[PDB]
Design a protein around this ligand. Structure first.
Ligand SMILES: O=C(O)[C@@H]1O[C@@H](O[C@H]2[C@H](O)[C@@H](NS(=O)(=O)O)[C@@H](O)O[C@@H]2COS(=O)(=O)O)[C@H](OS(=O)(=O)O)[C@@H](O)[C@@H]1O
Ligand SMILES: [Mg+2]
Ligand SMILES: [Zn+2]
Ligand SMILES: [Zn+2]
Ligand SMILES: [Zn+2]
Ligand SMILES: [Zn+2]
Ligand SMILES: [Zn+2]
Ligand SMILES: [Zn+2]
Lengths: 185, 12
């Protein structure tokens, strides 16, 4: 339901709100520092302390909102992508069992299944690329789970396309259309 | 879990 694009608007909102809250605190700190000139040293020290804690507290609030936004989006996108792929695969397997065989209908059901696998692959690569850009240490930690995910997608898609060559009549008829679809994937 | 979970050659 364009779930990744809803995550980008939410990500942008979060960021503008953080920038707004931060500039507000910097403004308040200027007013306070100015006012603390006429006060004793203990008040000058406390203003510095209250404002350092306020900026640190804001940094932590933003970090927590980011983390929770990424987690909620990853879980939502994975459930959605799994459901589309479960359905597109079930259809493709149903199309393969038609008597007499229906090659054009098998290809139509395969295209939708390959693309569903492709979206899962693409979105996994998009999320890992983000982590690599923003947090190399977290990326190095998740790299093996990501590559494992990519291995599952790739292997399952190959086990699936193999079923097509298992019905030689259908395969010989659509071998040109499948390879013209695979090279562009 | 898997192509296996769908039970393609027998039930569902
Ligand atoms: O050479 C042919 O394929 C030709 O056209 C067939 O039409 C097929 C459609 O192309 C399919 N959909 S598509 O989106 O246009 O690709 C599909 O609706 O069904 C048709 C056959 O494929 S399958 O058997 O369903 O797999 C004609 O099909 S017909 O037999 O239904 O009339 C075919 O006769 C004609 O040679
Ligand atoms: Mg991401
Ligand atoms: Zn995403
Ligand atoms: Zn204060
Ligand atoms: Zn910040
Ligand atoms: Zn991020
Ligand atoms: Zn997946
Ligand atoms: Zn992750």
């Amino acid at each position: 339901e364009n779930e990744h694009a809803h995550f980008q608007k939410a990500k942008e909102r979060l960021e503008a709100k953080h920038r707004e809250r931060m500039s507000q605190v910097m403004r308040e700190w200027e007013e306070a520092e100015r006012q603390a000139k006429n006060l004793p040293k203990a008040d000058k020290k406390a203003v510095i302390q209250h404002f350092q804690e306020k900026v640190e507290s804001l940094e932590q609030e933003a970090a927590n909102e980011r983390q929770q936004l990424v987690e909620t989006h990853m879980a939502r996108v994975e459930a959605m992508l799994n459901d589309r792929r479960r359905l597109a695969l079930e259809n493709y397997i149903t199309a393969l069992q038609a008597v007499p065989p229906r090659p054009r209908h098998v290809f139509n059901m395969l295209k939708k299944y390959v693309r569903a696998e492709q979206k899962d692959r693409q979105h996994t690569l998009k999320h890992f690329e983000h982590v690599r850009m923003v947090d190399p240490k977290k990326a190095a930690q998740i790299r093996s789970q990501v590559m494992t995910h990519l291995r599952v997608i790739y292997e399952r898609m190959n086990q699936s396309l193999s079923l097509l060559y298992n019905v030689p009549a259908v395969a010989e008829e659509i071998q040109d259309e499948v390879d013209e679809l695979l090279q562009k994937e």
